[PDB]
Design an enzyme around this catalytic site. Structure first.
Site, short mmCIF file in Angstrom:
data_model
loop_
_atom_site.label_atom_id
_atom_site.label_comp_id
_atom_site.label_asym_id
_atom_site.label_seq_id
_atom_site.Cartn_x
_atom_site.Cartn_y
_atom_site.Cartn_z
N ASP A 33 30.32 34.82 25.75
CA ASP A 33 31.75 34.88 25.60
C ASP A 33 31.97 35.78 24.38
O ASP A 33 31.11 35.85 23.50
CB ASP A 33 32.33 33.48 25.42
CG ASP A 33 33.80 33.49 25.03
OD1 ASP A 33 34.63 33.94 25.84
OD2 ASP A 33 34.11 33.01 23.92
N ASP A 75 35.35 36.21 22.33
CA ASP A 75 36.22 35.58 21.33
C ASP A 75 35.72 34.25 20.79
O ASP A 75 35.60 33.27 21.54
CB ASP A 75 37.61 35.39 21.93
CG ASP A 75 38.16 36.67 22.51
OD1 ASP A 75 38.80 37.41 21.75
OD2 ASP A 75 37.88 36.94 23.70
N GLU A 130 40.18 35.62 17.48
CA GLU A 130 40.67 35.74 18.84
C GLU A 130 41.47 37.03 18.93
O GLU A 130 42.48 37.19 18.24
CB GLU A 130 41.52 34.51 19.22
CG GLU A 130 40.76 33.16 19.24
CD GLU A 130 39.95 32.95 20.53
OE1 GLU A 130 40.37 33.49 21.58
OE2 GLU A 130 38.91 32.26 20.50
N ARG A 188 50.55 34.16 26.81
CA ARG A 188 50.18 34.77 25.54
C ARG A 188 50.31 36.30 25.59
O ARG A 188 50.83 36.91 24.67
CB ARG A 188 48.77 34.35 25.14
CG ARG A 188 48.67 32.91 24.63
CD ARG A 188 47.23 32.48 24.39
NE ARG A 188 46.50 32.33 25.64
CZ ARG A 188 45.18 32.36 25.75
NH1 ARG A 188 44.44 32.54 24.66
NH2 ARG A 188 44.60 32.22 26.94
N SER A 210 34.52 37.84 29.57
CA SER A 210 35.66 37.56 28.73
C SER A 210 36.96 37.55 29.49
O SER A 210 37.14 38.35 30.44
CB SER A 210 35.72 38.58 27.66
OG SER A 210 36.95 38.50 26.97
N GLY A 211 37.88 36.67 29.08
CA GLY A 211 39.24 36.69 29.60
C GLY A 211 40.07 37.72 28.86
O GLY A 211 41.24 37.94 29.16
N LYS A 269 34.66 33.37 35.28
CA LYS A 269 33.59 33.66 34.35
C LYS A 269 32.26 33.32 34.98
O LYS A 269 31.31 34.10 34.93
CB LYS A 269 33.78 32.91 33.03
CG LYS A 269 34.86 33.48 32.12
CD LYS A 269 34.62 33.09 30.67
CE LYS A 269 35.33 34.02 29.71
NZ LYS A 269 34.99 33.73 28.29
N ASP A 279 32.37 29.06 23.61
CA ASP A 279 32.98 28.12 22.67
C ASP A 279 34.15 27.32 23.24
O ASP A 279 34.49 26.27 22.71
CB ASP A 279 33.47 28.85 21.42
CG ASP A 279 34.64 29.76 21.69
OD1 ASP A 279 34.44 30.74 22.43
OD2 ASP A 279 35.75 29.50 21.19
N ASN A 314 37.42 27.37 28.53
CA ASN A 314 37.41 28.53 29.39
C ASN A 314 36.00 28.87 29.88
O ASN A 314 35.82 29.50 30.93
CB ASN A 314 38.01 29.71 28.62
CG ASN A 314 38.05 30.97 29.42
OD1 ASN A 314 37.71 32.05 28.93
ND2 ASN A 314 38.46 30.85 30.68
MG LIG Z 1 35.86 32.09 23.19
#
Ligand SMILES: [Mg+2]
Ligand SMILES: [Mg+2]
Lengths: 396, 396
Positions: B183, B185, B192, B228, B271-272, B316, B339, B342
Site C-alpha cells: 500500500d 499511503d 495521506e 474526499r 493504491s486507491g 486491491k 495499514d 482498505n
Molecule cells: Mg494506507
C-alpha cells in the site's frame, strides 16, 4: 537501562528452562539485547545479553535469583558485566558442503584442517542429509582474499579423500537463486540419446567413442555432432518415438524438479540433442524453457543431418542468458548443471555452475562437483535439507 | 561399519578443537553420520554421530584416544553407544519473530510460557536485529492442530506486553516468498496524499476525518473516496506535481526495497490513490507493478472526480492476483503490506499479510502486525537479519 550483562546457561536440556530464566529476569529491570539458544544432543546452551539499570547489575539480587533458579534444576550459569561485547554476531561469509558415501573422519578432518590453515572460522556445522548420501554443511567466515586459496585447498582435499566439497558465497544476493537449467544427456536423463539412436542403425560403438571424445573436450562439439548424427542417415523417423519411450530419468530427478518447483524456481533444459525427443519429455515434467537442436527428416526418414544453427558450447551459454533475460533473472542468481565439456561455457556464465558426474574438463571450471549418481544431491548445494524435502512431500 | 557411537564435546571455545577431534577419530575406523557444532558466547558444543565396526566401538582405544585429546585441552567429552538415536533432527514447523523497542524479559518470558503451554518445542533462538528495533527469532515445532491456538495466545501476549509477535509456517513452499506489494499511503509513504491535496483547497480537516473513518473500516471505501476527491474540485492540476515533490518515504523504505531487489523479489504498489503521483515515484524506485486510481482533469483543473473503475477493497486484492499472474507467482508465495481497512482483502489473498502501523480492523485479519515506524522491519519477517543487510550494503 544503563549497563550490559551477559547470562549464559549450559547443561543437560530440560523442559521449561527458557521460560524460567526470563520469568526470573522479569523480576529485575531487564530488557533484552540478544538471545541465542540451541540444543545439540540434549546439550543446552542459552546465551542472553541484557541491559539493566546500573541500579540492578551492581546487585547480588539479580545474580542470586538467577543462580539459584538455574543451579537448583541442575544446570550451570555464568553472569558477567560485559560492555565490551558484540550484541549480534556477523553473518558467515561462505558456506561449505561436504557430501560422501561415506564421509570418513579422515576426510572431514582434512577439510577442517585446510579451513583452519587459512584462518577461516567455522561459525556452524550441521547435517543436511542422511540419504542418499551423508551431507554436512559448514558456515564459515573467510578472511578477505583467502577464498580462492580455500577453494583450491578443498578441491585437492576432495580429490584425495573421495568426498564432494563445494564452497559457496553466503551473501544475500548470491544465494537468492531462482533459475536453473539442466543439460539433458547424462545429467537429467540417463545415457546419451544419440547413442540410443545410433544403436538402431547399428553404429552405437562408433558414436559412443566420438561422444566420449567430445564430452572430454578432445573434439569440436559441432563437428562431433555432425559426424554422429550422420550415422543415423536412412533410419525411419519413428526411431525418435522409440528412443523417447526408452528414456529413464537420472535417479533423484523427480525429487529434484518437484522440490525446485516448491521453491519457485524457473526450470529449463539446454541440450545439443534433439527437440522432438526433449520437448515431449519437457512438457511431461512441466518445464519452463527448452533449447535443443533439430533432426532433419525427409519423407519419414532421417537424412543424417541436423538443422542449423547448432547449439554448441557457446550456444548453450547463450541459451542460458536468453532464458534468464526472458525470466528477469540476473546471471548471478542462475544455476547450471551439466556433465560434459559441452557444458563448460554454460556453467561459466551461471552464478552457480554444478558439474554432475562430469568429465575432468568440466570439473575444472565448475563452481562445484557432484560425484554420486543422485541428481537430488543438487538440492543440498542449493541449501535444502533432506528433512525439508521429506517434510514437504509428507504434506503432499 | 556396524554400530553407532555418539561423541559430544562441550566447554570453552578454543581454536582447533574440530580438526583435532576428527584427526583423532580417523585413527580408528570412523565414518560420519552427522556433525552439529555451534559456539554461543564462547561456549562450544560439538556433537558427532559416527559408525565404526563393532570391532572398535567395543574398544577402550577409541574412548581413551578421544577422552585424552579432548580433556587435556580443558574441554569435556561424553561417548555413548547409541543405536536408538536419530541421525538428523526434523525441520522446525514454524518460526516466531519477536520485535520490540524494548523487548522486556517479561515480554519474552510471556512468549516462552505460551509456547510451552501448548506443547511447542523451541528448536532454536537467535537474534535477527539490534536496530532499528531488537528482533529475536524462535524456530519451533508445533503439535499438529495447535497452530491457531498458538497464534491466538501470542496475539494476546503481543497486545499486553508491547512487542510485535509473528508466527509463520516454516515449510519449504510457504517461505519461498518472491513477490511483494505495498500500500502507498501511510505504508510506503508518510501521510495521506489525498490530505496533502485537500490542504491546498483548504479542506484538509474534513478529508482527514473521512480518511480516518475509512481506514478504520467505518466507511465504504468507494463512497469515501468520492467524497474526499470532490473536495479537490476546482484546484489547478499542478497541485499534483506539488504534492509529488512533497512526498517523503517511510523510514526504512529505501533499505527495504533495496534489500528486496537483492533477494530477487518482484515489487509493486496497489493504491486507491492517484496514478499521476504514484507512477512517477514508482519509476524512481524502479518498481515492477502499479495499480492506482485516476484523477479527472479538465482544462488543467481537477473536476473533483475520479475516473472509474475505482480500486476498492476487493479491487486491491484483485490487483494482487493480477500482478502475481503476470509474475508467475503463486498467491502462497506473495506478500502484502498495508495499514488500513482498505487493505483487508489484499492482505487476506496474500500468502503473507503484514499490517504496518495499522488500524485495528487490519490487524485483526493480518498474518502479522508491525507497530514500529520502520518499514525495514518488514525484512525481518521475511527471514533477513540486520547483519546480512549491513553486510550486503558494505560490498555495495
Ligand atoms: Mg494506507
Ligand atoms: Mg551431457
Amino acid at each position: 537501562p544503563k549497563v550490559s550483562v551477559l547470562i549464559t546457561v549450559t547443561g543437560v536440556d530440560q523442559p521449561g528452562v527458557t521460560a524460567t530464566l526470563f520469568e526470573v529476569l522479569s523480576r529485575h529491570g531487564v530488557e533484552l539485547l540478544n538471545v541465542e539458544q540451541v540444543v545439540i544432543r540434549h546439550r543446552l546452551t542459552l546465551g542472553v545479553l541484557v541491559c539493566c539499570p546500573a541500579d540492578v547489575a551492581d546487585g547480588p539480587a539479580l545474580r542470586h535469583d538467577v543462580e539459584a533458579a538455574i543451579r537448583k534444576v541442575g544446570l550451570d550459569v555464568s553472569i558477567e558485566r560485559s560492555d565490551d561485547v558484540p550484541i549480534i554476531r556477523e553473518p558467515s561469509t561462505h558456506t561449505i558442503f561436504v557430501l560422501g558415501r561415506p564421509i570418513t573422519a579422515a576426510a572431514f578432518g582434512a577439510v577442517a584442517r585446510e579451513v583452519a590453515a587459512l584462518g577461516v572460522n567455522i561459525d556452524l556445522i550441521r547435517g543436511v542429509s542422511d540419504y542418499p548420501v551423508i551431507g554436512l554443511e559448514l558456515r564459515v567466515s573467510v578472511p578477505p582474499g583467502a577464498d580462492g586459496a580455500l577453494r583450491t585447498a578443498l578441491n585437492r582435499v576432495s580429490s584425495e579423500e573421495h568426498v564432494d566439497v563445494a564452497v559457496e558465497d553466503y551473501t544475500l544476493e548470491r544465494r537468492a537463486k531462482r533459475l536453473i537449467v539442466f543439460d539433458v544427456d547424462s545429467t537429467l536423463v540417463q545415457g546419451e540419446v544419440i547413442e540410443m539412436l545410433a544403436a538402431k542403425a547399428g553404429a552405437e560403438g562408433q558414436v559412443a567413442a566420438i561422444t566420449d571424445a567430445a564430452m572430454r573436450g578432445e573434439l569440436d562439439f559441432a563437428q562431433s555432432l555432425q559426424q554422429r548424427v550422420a550415422t543415423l542417415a536412412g533410419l525411419p523417423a519413428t526411431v525418435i518415438d522409440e528412443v523417447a519411450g526408452q528414456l529413464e530419468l537420472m535417479p533423484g530427478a523427480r525429487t529434484t524438479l518437484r522440490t525446485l518447483r516448491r521453491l519457485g524456481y524457473a526450470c529449463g533444459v539446454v541440450s545439443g540433442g534433439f527437440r522432438r525427443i526433449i520437448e515431449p519429455l519437457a512438457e511431461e515434467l512441466m518445464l519452463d524453457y527448452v533449447a535443443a537442436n533439430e533432426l532433419e527428416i525427409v519423407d519419414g526418414t532421417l537424412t543424417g543431418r541436423v538443422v542449423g544453427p547448432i547449439i554448441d558450447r557457446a550456444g548453450k551459454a547463450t541459451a542460458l542468458r536468453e532464458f534468464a533475460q526472458r525470466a528477469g533473472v540476473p546471471m548471478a542468481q542462475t544455476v547450471a548443471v551439466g556433465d560434459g565439456a559441452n557444458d563448460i561455457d554454460m556453467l561459466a556464465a551461471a552464478g552457480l555452475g554444478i558439474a554432475f558426474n562430469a568429465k575432468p574438463a568440466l570439473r575444472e571450471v565448475a563452481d562445484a562437483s557432484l560425484s554420486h549418481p543422485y541428481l537430488d544431491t543438487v538440492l543440498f548445494l542449493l541449501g535444502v535439507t533432506r528433512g525439508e524435502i521429506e517434510a514437504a512431500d509428507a504434506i503432499d
